[PDB]
Amino acid sequence: EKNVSIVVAASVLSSGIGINGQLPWSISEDLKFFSKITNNKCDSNKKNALIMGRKTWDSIGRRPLKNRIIVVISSSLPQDEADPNVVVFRNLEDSIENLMNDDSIENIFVCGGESIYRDALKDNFVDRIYLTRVALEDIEFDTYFPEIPETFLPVYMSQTFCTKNISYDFMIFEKQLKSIDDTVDLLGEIFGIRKMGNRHKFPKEEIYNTPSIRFGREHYEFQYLDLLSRVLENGAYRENRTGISTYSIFGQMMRFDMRESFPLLTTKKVAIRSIFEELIWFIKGDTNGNHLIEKKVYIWSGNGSKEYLERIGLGHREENDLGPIYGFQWRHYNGEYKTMHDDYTGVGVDQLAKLIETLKNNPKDRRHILTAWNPSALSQMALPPCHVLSQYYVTNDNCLSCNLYQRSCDLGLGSPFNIASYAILTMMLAQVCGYEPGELAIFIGDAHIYENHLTQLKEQLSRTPRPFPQLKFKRKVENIEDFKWEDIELIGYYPYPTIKMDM
Amino acid sequence: EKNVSIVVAASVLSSGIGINGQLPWSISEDLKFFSKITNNKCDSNKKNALIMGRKTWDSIGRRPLKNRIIVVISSSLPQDEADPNVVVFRNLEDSIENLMNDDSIENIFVCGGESIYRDALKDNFVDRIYLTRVALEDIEFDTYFPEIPETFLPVYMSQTFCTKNISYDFMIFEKQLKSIDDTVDLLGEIFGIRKMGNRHKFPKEEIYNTPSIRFGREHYEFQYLDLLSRVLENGAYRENRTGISTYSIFGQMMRFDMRESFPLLTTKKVAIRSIFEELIWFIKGDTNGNHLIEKKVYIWSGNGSKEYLERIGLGHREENDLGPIYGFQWRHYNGEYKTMHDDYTGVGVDQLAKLIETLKNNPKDRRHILTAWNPSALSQMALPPCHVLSQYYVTNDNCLSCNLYQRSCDLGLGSPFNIASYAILTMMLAQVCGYEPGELAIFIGDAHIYENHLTQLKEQLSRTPRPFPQLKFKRKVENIEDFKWEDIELIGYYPYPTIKMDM
Ligand SMILES: NC(=O)C1=CN([C@@H]2O[C@H](COP(=O)(O)OP(=O)(O)OC[C@H]3O[C@@H](n4cnc5c(N)ncnc54)[C@H](OP(=O)(O)O)[C@@H]3O)[C@@H](O)[C@H]2O)C=CC1
Ligand SMILES: NC(=O)C1=CN([C@@H]2O[C@H](COP(=O)(O)OP(=O)(O)OC[C@H]3O[C@@H](n4cnc5c(N)ncnc54)[C@H](OP(=O)(O)O)[C@@H]3O)[C@@H](O)[C@H]2O)C=CC1
Ligand SMILES: CN(Cc1cnc2nc(N)nc(N)c2n1)c1ccc(C(=O)N[C@@H](CCC(=O)O)C(=O)O)cc1
Ligand SMILES: CN(Cc1cnc2nc(N)nc(N)c2n1)c1ccc(C(=O)N[C@@H](CCC(=O)O)C(=O)O)cc1
CATH class of the missing domain: 3.30.572.10 (Thymidylate synthase/dCMP hydroxymethylase domain)
Structure with a gap:
């Protein structure tokens, strides 16, 4: 009565494991994980057993594995005791005599094609499933991993890793x-x-x-999903200016890794082009909303209309003429604002250019700060800033990390955009300065959820997340302004369908 | 072979439990905890047993306790079966027959003076200790709680609570x-x-x-202590201008409760008077460092000397003219700085006054922000600000909370001072606005530890913390500027000795 575990690496959506008798991928760290999980034992005098079908035995080249016993299930292969590393049995059920008869075996592992995966899952002897979720779907498979029965439950989901721009997770399932x-x-x-x-x-x-x-x-x-759950548990009801009531909790934090993946939410499809288009809009220092609507982006349509620009105290602005907003506070902090159809080149202080200069000539500094909260120009701007502060940090191994403080953050629609926006921004700064992306940490003051998003956000919490995509650049640019959507490659993004949340 | 547990409330330092046959205190919630821990059972048909000496039996007035059996250990009391709620035994050892003989009892509790605590601890009958750490030492005791043997280890330590300005904790100890x-x-x-x-x-x-x-x-x-431990575990070595090296980790957080205690560190004595004098100095909007040195405060003495005013570029300033720092950015943000002893009345925007006005006239707002990071005046300051941002929040139950973002924070000497400084500030803002203190959250960018503090900080980590003190005001002030040191009362502060950490 020992411990039997299934070890498999399969695609995230199609759950495919092989193509034309070989692996569909070449992930060096996956094989290393396979060796470390199958050699992990406690007694030095026992060994671990690895069960696989003949085709899988042919797949790995009929070569043994060090410090392990390979059990091959075949109806034609010859049985000879000359090699104790390879043993041949005629069926899977009768091959599970390692617990009853052989006391020189500690743990058994099942890892051999769908013919064996299917039978092992139906026979109720498997206690655990070690799953590597590979983010590859373009290619076709001829052997798939069978669906995990409802008797198993996920107990572990590692961070997303990268190998040759391919994302993959590590998961554990336990029969409970x-x-x-x-x-x-x-x-x-x-x-x-x-x-x-x-x-x-x-x-x-x-x-x-x-x-x-x-x-x-x-x-x-989970850093985002669990924050969503905390608001739903003990969020306080708050009426506001209009009729859109919220539920707020104060002082929250979530952090993300950017060294091996891009934190683009997978529990719902996130429009990344519109996120990118608003970021370069900030970086270029632009304040004109018409530039955004001319690129199929309507994020700043409800905050820049004539009705909304006359009931807040303004009304003398153009059709979509936000005041000193993000970008104008990054490139031209302070400085007198006239209209949207002017050139603010050279006015104010350029925090972004000073940031890039300090990141390359004084990396160990602690003043790499980019603020957008100007109390003098708050009442002349369309909407007060939400990403009020961002600090950057150069680790000892040449990685650029980022802290973000938000006074306000709609978890429904705001947080998914801010996470990706400041992750892209950090990766863009990292390439220009000659660094690699590091970590991202979000600090939130008033974390709130609008009441009309409850049914929709409760659907997102019902979706088990998938490995993060990869975000890589094609060329190497010289200045931060020269980035365009053609230079961005989003690899391995396999999200759940969109969730229409109206603002 | 059931479960025997000790329940006691003792002083934090002296561990005294009684005086003149009565309790040294009157903490209502402590007695409520006593009732909930001694009634907590699983079977509805069984009872719990409470063992106590005769003097303790006399202490509670010889009146039974509902739904519980009281076992009195005495050599003179008579044994009569007329009352099944009170049973009298002649010795402790023979009174522990509830596990062997009586099957109508689920759990046993020892709670009766040091004579019984001493015998129960020496006889290896106790499996758990429920300790309430009362923060009272001025009065004298005649009965103490015996020292906890090394076989027990603390497994739980509750937050600090308040009752009639008296602090107390709740702890659990388990034999292993x-x-x-x-x-x-x-x-x-x-x-x-x-x-x-x-x-x-x-x-x-x-x-x-x-x-x-x-x-x-x-x-x-523990929010501070565990942050200190994380820097010691994975802090990266960083050289700087001279030779004073630090160890840094990026993106950290710690939060504190202010509804029931004051977060003044107890693992080392924190000088509170000098902290308060610099805080009111900020509120008054003062920029002249001599006002601080006239009150035995040298926080801004090494950063405002002539040696420090020739390496940053501001050599034309007076002896102690720090410049636009915390306070000038709170009371006269933007504008223009001339000298230290001129009148800036009416220049710039007064964030502090606008904050107080909005906290009482627009509590559900989300713009309660006080910033001190001005990119236009960064090179005009003695030292760039460390508490770059502070946001305030009014809960639904009329409590004022505070978020603080620090780009830099020396954990050795800065964090203990910053925690107390912004806690006092929140308490002062809460009284002026008619609220009560809520929570405090510190967000830190570059959390660092100086190399010459390693041996000293590891000594602080060897000290088990004590319940937080209470900080209460004596009078009710009219404006935020009228606060004085005479109006501050620190109750029940029992810290470990100071740790001389040289800068
Ligand atoms: N991504 C991953 O983690 C893994 C992927 N793979 C891939 O899967 C592919 C191979 O797997 P697959 O095609 O499904 O074949 P299998 O590995 O499941 O092996 C099948 C063979 O095993 C024998 N066999 C199976 N069931 C029985 C039975 N009930 N009684 C007797 N003999 C039996 C038969 O051999 P015989 O002809 O002798 O009767 C059969 O042809 C390869 O491409 C491989 O690379 C393999 C392992 C892991
Ligand atoms: N803060 C707290 O949690 C608690 C505080 N207290 C306080 O402690 C004080 C009383 O405790 P304390 O003074 O230590 O007295 P005890 O509660 O320990 O009771 C002592 C009495 O029990 C009997 N007794 C004790 N040991 C033995 C023995 N080995 N064999 C036989 N009989 C024994 C004796 O009675 P006899 O005269 O018959 O010999 C003795 O006088 C009170 O002030 C009370 O309020 C009490 C409980 C809890
Ligand atoms: C059966 N099979 C196909 C294969 C490939 N990847 C997988 N990955 C996972 N997570 N699970 C599997 N069952 C799995 N199976 C295998 C098994 C072992 C090796 C292999 O080369 N193992 C070397 C590993 C070499 C190295 O350390 O990288 C070893 O010494 O164990 C290759 C294919
Ligand atoms: C023996 N004793 C002294 C006393 C006082 N405080 C303590 N506090 C602790 N944590 N532990 C003790 N053993 C303890 N003992 C007691 C015990 C019960 C009551 C008492 O009044 N109990 C009521 C409580 C009433 C209420 O709910 O507040 C009850 O119904 O149990 C007073 C003194």
Whole structure:
């Protein structure tokens, strides 16, 4: 009665594992993971057993594996005891005698084609599934991994890794002291809102994304999803200026890795071109909303109309003429603003150019700060800034990281755009300065959820996330302004369908 | 063979429990905790047993406790079966027959003076200790709680609570799946710094404050101590202009509760008077450093001397004319700086006054922002600001919370001072606006530790923290400027000795 585990690497959507008798990919770290998971034992005198079909045995070239016993399931292969590293059995069920008969085996692993994966899943002897989710779907497969029965539950999901611009995860599925929790609950009954834990309750299982993953929430998309759950659990109802009521919690944080993946949310399809188009719009220092609507982008349409520019206190602006906004505060901080149809080249202080200069000539500094919150020009701008501050950091191994502070953040539509926007911005700065992308950390003040997004956000929490895509540039640019959408390649992006959330 | 637990409330330093046959205090919530921990059972048909000495039985007035059996250990009291709620035994050892003989009892509790605590701890009958750490030492005791043997280890430490300006904690002591951790460790060997977990390793047991508390790190001083441990674990070495090297990690967070305590560090004595004098100096909008040196405050003495005013470029200033720093950016943001002793009344925008006006007349707003990072006046300052941003938030129950972003923060001497400085500031803003203090959250960019503080900071990490003190105001002020040191009352502050960390 030992431990039997399935080890497989399959595509994220199609769940394919092979093509023409070979692997569909060449991921060096995946094979390393295979060797480390199949050699992991406790007793030095026992060995681990690896079960595979004949075609899989032919697939790996009929060459043994060090420190492991290979069990091949075939009806034609000859059985000879001259090689103890390879053993041949006639069926999978009778090959599971390693627990009953052989006491020189600690753990068994099933890893051999769909013929064996199918039978092993139906026979109720497998206790665990080690799954590597490869983000490859362009090519075709002839052997697939069977669907995981409902009896297994995900317990671990690693961060996204990269190998030759290919993204992949690592997942575990499992077939499925205390006086502290009872003392904390009793303390929470005595003190009401006086105990801070009651103000920061853990979200209930009905609003927790993939609740069976209780300890292996390594995948950094959970940083956003779990923040979404915390607002749904203990968010306070707040009426506002109009009728769009929110639920707010104050002081939150989420961080993302940019060294091996691009944090583009996979639990819903995120329009990345419009995110990129608004970022270069910021970088170029532009304030004209018509430049955005001329590129099929309507993010700043409701905040720049004539009705919205006359009920806030203005009204003398053009049709879509936001005032000193993001970009004008990055490239021309302070400085007198006239209209949208002027050239502000050389006015104010250019924080972005000074940032690039300090990143390349003083990397170990601690003043790489880009602010967009100008209290003097708040009442002459269309909407006060939400990404009020961003600080950048050069690690010892030549990586550029980024901190972002947001006073405001709609989790429904704002956060997915801000995460990708400041990740692209950091990668763009990283290439210009000669660095590699590092980490991103988002600090949020008033994290809120609009009431008309509840049904829709509760659908996103029902989707198990997928590995992050890759974002790579084609050419190497000279200045930050020369970036265009033609230079961006989004690789391995396989999101769930869109979620129409109206603003 | 059931479960025997000690329940006691004792002083934080002296560990005294009684005086003249009564309790030294009157903490209502402590008695409520006593009732909830002693009634907590699983079977509805069983009862819990409470063991106490006769003097303790006399202490509670010889009146029974509902739904519980009281066992009195005395050598004179009579034994009569007329009352099944009170049973009298002649010795402690023979009174522990509830596990052997009586099957109508689920859990046993020891809670009766040092004579019984001493015997129960020496006889190896106690499996758990529920300790309430009361922060009272002025009065004298005649009965103490015996020292906790080394076989027990702390597993839980609640946040600090308040009752009649008296602080107290709740602690638990105990006498002393897996495939996920092995897969993460194997993944961490394949990928080096490519796995974000290896860049954010958990600190080793030798630099973790109170390592036995693995899940009950409720006390919010652990937010600082664990941040200190993370820098010691994966901080990167960084040379600078001279030879004073630091160890930095980027993007960190710690939060504190202000509804029931004041986050003044107890693992080392923090000088509170000098912190307060610089804070009101900020509020008054003053930029002249001599105002601080006239009150035995040398925070801005080394940064405003003639040696420091010739290497930044501002050599034409007076002896102590720091310039546009915290305070001038709060009260007279933008504008223009001339000298230190002239009148800037009416210049720029007053963020602090606009903040106070908006906090009471627009509490549900989301623009309660106080910034001090001005890119136009950065090169006109003695030292660029460290508390670059602070946002405030009014909860639905009329509480004022605060977020703080720090681009730089020396954990050795700066963070303990910044935590107390902005906690006092939030408490002062809360009284003026008619609110109560809420939560405090610190967001740190470059969290660093100076190399000459390593031995000293590792000493602070060996000290188990104590309940936070209380900070209360004496009078009610009219304006934020009228606060004085005479109006501040620090109650129940019992820190470990100071740690001389030289700069
Ligand atoms: N991505 C991944 O993790 C992995 C991918 N692969 C890929 O999968 C492909 C091969 O797998 P696949 O095509 O499904 O073939 P299989 O590996 O499942 O092996 C099938 C063969 O095993 C024997 N066999 C199977 N079932 C039985 C049975 N019930 N009784 C007796 N003998 C049995 C038969 O051999 P016989 O002719 O002797 O009777 C059969 O032809 C390869 O391309 C390989 O690269 C393989 C392993 C892992
Ligand atoms: N802060 C807290 O959590 C608590 C505080 N207290 C305080 O402590 C004080 C009282 O405790 P304390 O003074 O230590 O007295 P105890 O509560 O320990 O009770 C002592 C009495 O129990 C009997 N007794 C004790 N040991 C033995 C023994 N080995 N064999 C037989 N009988 C024994 C004796 O009664 P006899 O005379 O018959 O010999 C003795 O007088 C009070 O002020 C009370 O308020 C009490 C409980 C909890
Ligand atoms: C059966 N098979 C196909 C294959 C490929 N990748 C997988 N990946 C996973 N996660 N799971 C599988 N079952 C799996 N199977 C294999 C098995 C081992 C080797 C292999 O070369 N192993 C070397 C690994 C060499 C190295 O360290 O990279 C070893 O010594 O164990 C190749 C293909
Ligand atoms: C023995 N004793 C002294 C006393 C006081 N505080 C303590 N506090 C702690 N944490 N632990 C103790 N053992 C303890 N003991 C007691 C015990 C119960 C009551 C008491 O009044 N209990 C009521 C509580 C009433 C209420 O709910 O507030 C009950 O119904 O149990 C007073 C003193």
